Design a protein around this ligand. Structure first.
Ligand SMILES: CC(=O)N[C@H]1[C@@H](OCc2ccccc2)O[C@H](CO)[C@H](O)[C@@H]1O[C@@H]1O[C@H](CO)[C@H](O)[C@H](O)[C@H]1O
Ligand SMILES: CC(=O)N[C@H]1[C@@H](OCc2ccccc2)O[C@H](CO)[C@H](O)[C@@H]1O[C@@H]1O[C@H](CO)[C@H](O)[C@H](O)[C@H]1O
Lengths: 299, 299
């Protein structure tokens, strides 16, 4: 029903992601808006269309793989614990929900309606222990907007924008081609997003590796001399040269670290000491460090 | 190919479960046998049978939802990062694996063969930081059995024994029916498993709640007088009475805690001080405590 197959839900009320409560407490199994990162492995939910009613959806925790349902015949609290879907709208354990979009056209802002109850769900707090749990309150839209959620496609976190992009390093500069000592280097030394030497294109392959092409040079990034990433490579989708293949480590939307597949070390802003090699891309760190975090800027 | 749709892999070698490496380290994305508990949200994998090759399978991390594939054309290390499966047996990024059962008929002990390489995968260590990672070493069986794994069906940890069972309290005693003041109580005070009063039957419903029946009395457990759990209930599957419905918090195989759905507190071995009610089951703890830990012994 317009929702992502695997999704994450964020609450504007306090900017946290919905996650399965796994602590051994009274609230075990309930859903709390407490995941700080979208990467939290308890924050994924899979949506499944209703067999019978078009527009209605079933939702299960990816972790437990069990459906969202009312805690008991007497509760409005939602638990990701049903072994199977129930489409009988009259049953208190009916698992059907109805996504209702807040602003027409926008699929990333929704309200989730528990079908059987006809109540909207909210990031609800009662007292002391029941803080920020998913609760099907009533048929009235909330005044504090605690029933509005931001939908996020889990899949998209591991996707990159193909089209010209540049990378912004931790010194505030943009990554551009630069010839140094007859070597076609990449340097975090540009201040302008319009200098065309700053443009690159990312190709993500089916196996997961990524190859990047400098627009200016029309050549691919490739680990080479002294582990500098140089812009001289041929298309590795054809050559299968590990030196021109990268695997990303996503920190958040458009914030990543890339591991070069030849050295299996992370690329980062580096200044070797040798004259001219200042703030140039080098596979110089085994584990992620501050200089290894790249922010992707779409052009 | 005989494997469960969602599974966890345990290393025969050092008894840890296979899990996705999420740290921002060189090994990010690789699979390490470091999960101490099956409940680790990074230890579940899903199996997809091959489209063209009978007996072959593709495997993905439930978390990333990406397929296990070689790290690069030059590595035998396995990473859960392929975007899609690849059935081309010649390509280095081929995602096919062949499960080989160690003991004929036993679908639980297996060796996983990387089809493209023709190599068995092992809980492999190279030193330093490449400790205990899945590596398709060679076509030779390993003398240390680091290539033999125990397959656990993820869905089976939320399931309980059919037929008779009893519950062992933390005081080392079994739970049996006992009449105290005409109130048919459940007490942790028996040592005989063949005592008929110690026999119970668990029923898991499609919505996740459980109802438990004493066989001796032939009545269901039910929260009643003074939050004591008495054996006087009618089938809550017909009554829908929250007082006779429980939801489990699974700690490990046959080690659970039961929350009563009426009080929404866990049941535990309890002695109120009120003369006579010693070590009887009472919904007396908000969060799990040691007395609330029950061990299911199947009769
Ligand atoms: C209907 C429901 O889930 N009520 C639960 C809620 O109560 C506040 C409320 C707000 C808005 C609309 C209706 C109700 O939260 C309470 C938190 O302690 C409580 O869970 C309550 O549910 C009752 O819990 C009782 C046990 O503590 C008992 O089981 C009652 O039968 C429940 O309705
Ligand atoms: C083939 C392979 O994955 N080799 C990797 C392995 O080497 C030990 C080994 C044991 C048994 C059979 C073959 C090899 O572990 C190494 C750990 O540091 C390393 O990952 C090695 O892979 C090489 O790594 C190189 C850089 O680290 C380079 O990328 C080579 O192309 C790789 O083969």
């Amino acid at each position: 029903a317009g929702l992502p197959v695997i999704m994450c839900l964020k609450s504007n009320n306090h900017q946290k992601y919905l996650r399965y409560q796994s602590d051994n407490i009274q609230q075990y199994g309930l859903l709390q808006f407490s995941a700080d990162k979208i990467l939290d492995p308890l924050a994924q939910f899979e949506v499944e269309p209703s067999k019978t009613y078009d527009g209605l959806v079933h939702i299960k925790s990816r972790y437990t793989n069990k459906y969202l349902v009312r805690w008991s015949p007497n509760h409005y609290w939602i638990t990701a614990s049903a072994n199977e879907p129930d489409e009988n709208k009259s049953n208190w354990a009916c698992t059907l929900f109805k996504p209702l979009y807040v602003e027409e056209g926008n699929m990333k802002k929704v309200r989730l309606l528990h079908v059987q109850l006809g109540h909207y769900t909210q990031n609800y707090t009662v007292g002391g222990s029941f803080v920020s749990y998913l609760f099907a309150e009533s048929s009235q839209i909330d005044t504090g907007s605690k029933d509005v959620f931001h939908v996020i496609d889990w899949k998209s976190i591991f996707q990159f924008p193909k089209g010209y992009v540049t990378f912004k390093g931790n010194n505030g500069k943009y990554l551009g081609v630069i010839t140094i000592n007859q070597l076609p280097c990449l340097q975090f030394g540009y201040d302008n997003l319009n200098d065309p030497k700053v443009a690159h294109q990312m190709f993500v392959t089916s196996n997961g590796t990524i190859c990047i092409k400098s627009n200016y040079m029309n050549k691919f990034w490739r680990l080479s001399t002294d582990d500098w990433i140089l812009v001289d490579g041929n298309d590795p989708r054809e050559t299968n040269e590990a030196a021109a293949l990268f695997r990303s480590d996503v920190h958040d939307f458009n914030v990543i670290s890339l591991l070069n597949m030849q050295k299996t070390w992370f690329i980062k802003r580096f200044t070797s000491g040798k004259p001219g090699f200042i703030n140039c891309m080098n596979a110089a760190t085994q584990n992620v460090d501050e200089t290894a975090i790249l922010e992707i800027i779409e052009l």
